[PDB]
Design an enzyme around this catalytic site. Structure first.
Site, mmCIF file in Angstrom:
data_model
loop_
_atom_site.group_PDB
_atom_site.id
_atom_site.type_symbol
_atom_site.label_atom_id
_atom_site.label_comp_id
_atom_site.label_asym_id
_atom_site.label_seq_id
_atom_site.Cartn_x
_atom_site.Cartn_y
_atom_site.Cartn_z
ATOM 1 N N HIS A 61 0.988 -1.305 -0.055
ATOM 2 C CA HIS A 61 -0.074 0.054 0.014
ATOM 3 C C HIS A 61 0.789 1.345 -0.096
ATOM 4 O O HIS A 61 0.456 2.279 -0.455
ATOM 5 C CB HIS A 61 -0.941 0.156 1.325
ATOM 6 C CG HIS A 61 -1.722 -1.290 1.303
ATOM 7 N ND1 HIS A 61 -1.583 -2.293 2.093
ATOM 8 C CD2 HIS A 61 -2.892 -1.433 0.559
ATOM 9 C CE1 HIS A 61 -2.464 -3.179 1.907
ATOM 10 N NE2 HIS A 61 -3.258 -2.956 1.094
ATOM 11 N N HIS A 91 5.229 6.743 6.892
ATOM 12 C CA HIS A 91 5.147 6.459 5.640
ATOM 13 C C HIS A 91 4.449 7.565 4.874
ATOM 14 O O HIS A 91 4.188 8.746 5.436
ATOM 15 C CB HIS A 91 4.171 5.491 5.447
ATOM 16 C CG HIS A 91 2.839 5.630 6.114
ATOM 17 N ND1 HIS A 91 2.734 5.594 7.503
ATOM 18 C CD2 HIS A 91 1.635 6.264 5.523
ATOM 19 C CE1 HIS A 91 1.588 6.185 7.876
ATOM 20 N NE2 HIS A 91 0.720 6.601 6.560
ATOM 21 N N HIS A 93 2.080 9.216 1.345
ATOM 22 C CA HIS A 93 0.924 9.156 0.465
ATOM 23 C C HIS A 93 1.120 9.988 -0.625
ATOM 24 O O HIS A 93 1.589 11.080 -0.490
ATOM 25 C CB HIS A 93 -0.319 9.241 1.040
ATOM 26 C CG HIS A 93 -0.955 8.455 2.214
ATOM 27 N ND1 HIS A 93 -1.641 7.490 2.073
ATOM 28 C CD2 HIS A 93 -0.650 8.711 3.588
ATOM 29 C CE1 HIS A 93 -1.749 6.880 3.408
ATOM 30 N NE2 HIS A 93 -1.175 7.748 4.194
ATOM 31 N N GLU A 103 -3.414 13.596 1.496
ATOM 32 C CA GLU A 103 -4.699 13.231 1.833
ATOM 33 C C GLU A 103 -5.434 14.438 2.248
ATOM 34 O O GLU A 103 -6.590 14.388 1.922
ATOM 35 C CB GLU A 103 -4.562 11.842 2.910
ATOM 36 C CG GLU A 103 -3.895 10.911 2.444
ATOM 37 C CD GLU A 103 -4.299 9.552 3.221
ATOM 38 O OE1 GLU A 103 -3.854 9.498 4.401
ATOM 39 O OE2 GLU A 103 -4.755 8.670 2.575
ATOM 40 N N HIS A 116 3.313 10.894 7.125
ATOM 41 C CA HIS A 116 2.608 10.660 8.253
ATOM 42 C C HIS A 116 3.464 9.880 9.184
ATOM 43 O O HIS A 116 4.015 9.004 8.932
ATOM 44 C CB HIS A 116 1.372 9.719 8.006
ATOM 45 C CG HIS A 116 0.359 10.254 7.227
ATOM 46 N ND1 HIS A 116 -0.902 9.784 6.600
ATOM 47 C CD2 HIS A 116 0.089 11.645 7.338
ATOM 48 C CE1 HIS A 116 -1.593 10.530 6.135
ATOM 49 N NE2 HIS A 116 -1.345 11.786 6.299
ATOM 50 N N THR A 195 -6.464 6.639 7.930
ATOM 51 C CA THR A 195 -6.919 6.967 6.635
ATOM 52 C C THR A 195 -6.826 5.669 5.675
ATOM 53 O O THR A 195 -7.079 5.801 4.499
ATOM 54 C CB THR A 195 -6.098 7.935 6.037
ATOM 55 O OG1 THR A 195 -4.737 7.429 5.593
ATOM 56 C CG2 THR A 195 -6.035 9.408 6.743
#
Ligand SMILES: CC(=O)OC[C@H]1O[C@@H](O[C@H]2[C@H](OC(C)=O)[C@@H](OC(C)=O)[C@H](S(N)(=O)=O)O[C@@H]2COC(C)=O)[C@H](OC(C)=O)[C@@H](OC(C)=O)[C@H]1OC(C)=O
Ligand SMILES: [Zn+2]
Length: 257
Positions: A61, A91, A93, A103, A116, A195
């Protein structure tokens, strides 16, 4: 299982995780003109001096840089937080294009990516117990915009070739997370959730106002990662972000005017 594709993306999560339509879901759009300056918010304390990184893993992911959280080595305190929260992993996004990837959004503006840094409340003994509490986690969110390179991020960028596919991991010791922080610690904060599934509503979000800059070359390497495992059709790891959710009965507080 769940993912970010058309048939298993954010729009489908509520079927296996009904909390996806809950009362305090994340991310959310931060309307800077609705946020309330809170002069009672104590100073934010990021103590990452004794941070002990251990490994970097591609989990299908995103990729997580894990830390040793058996002691109060790297912790987050102050701000809207009561107690001590230990750093366990960080990590990102990101998107397929520079105009998307984050996000949270600010006045609907989407950033190229979002970092994050996840911490858990030590009063609960372990991470697993903490996620079952309304104040179990504190996640520090930092926006990334494409501009000049971020020196502190290159060490991460350099190892991505070794964890291209799902399941791959590499040793990643002696990494200093302090190198990923912007100059200012001004922030917005609100009660939210993870999230990604299981989307537990156990997070106190602390989103920094000032984004950090990363080079086009650095972001490009993020986009070379794979969602799939080795020996499987290639699916580039991009757009692993959940869109903004309804704010509902929540207020966003700002640490600055
Ligand atoms: C639901 C549960 O039983 O435990 C909660 C889960 O915590 C997951 O860790 C993060 C997650 O890190 C990941 C996915 O590697 C994190 O970042 C993501 C999903 O990209 C998200 S986020 N975006 O809100 O920051 O939050 C998750 C919750 O934990 C946090 C915030 O620290 C665990 O790893 C995951 C989901 O990959 C997850 O492990 C699972 C599921 O197997 C799970 O922890 C447990 C008990 O397994
Ligand atoms: Zn995240």
């Amino acid at each position: 299982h769940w993912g970010y594709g058309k048939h298993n993306g954010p729009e489908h999560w509520h079927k296996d995780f009904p909390i996806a339509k809950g009362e305090r879901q994340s991310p959310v759009d931060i309307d800077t003109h609705t946020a309330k300056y809170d002069p009672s918010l104590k100073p934010l304390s990021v103590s990452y001096d004794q941070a002990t990184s251990l490994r970097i893993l591609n989990n299908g992911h995103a990729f997580n840089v894990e830390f040793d959280d058996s002691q109060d080595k790297a912790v987050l305190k102050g701000g809207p937080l009561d107690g001590t929260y230990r750093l366990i992993q960080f990590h990102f996004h990101w998107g397929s294009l520079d105009g998307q990837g984050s996000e949270h959004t600010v006045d609907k503006k989407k950033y190229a990516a979002e970092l994050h840094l996840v911490h858990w409340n030590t009063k609960y003994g372990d991470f697993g117990k903490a996620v079952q509490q309304p104040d179990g986690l504190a996640v520090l969110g930092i926006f990334l915009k494409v501009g000049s390179a971020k020196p502190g991020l290159q060490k991460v960028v350099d190892v991505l070739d070794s964890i291209k596919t799902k399941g791959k991991s590499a040793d990643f010791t002696n990494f200093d997370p302090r190198g990923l922080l912007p100059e200012s610690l001004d922030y917005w904060t609100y009660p939210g959730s993870l999230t990604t599934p299981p989307l537990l509503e156990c997070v106190t979000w602390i989103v920094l106002k000032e984004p950090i800059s990363v080079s086009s070359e650095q972001v490009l390497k993020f986009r070379k990662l794979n969602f799939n495992g080795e020996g499987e059709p290639e699916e580039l790891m991009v757009d692993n972000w959940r869109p903004a959710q309804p704010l509902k009965n929540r207020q966003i507080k700002a640490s600055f005017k």
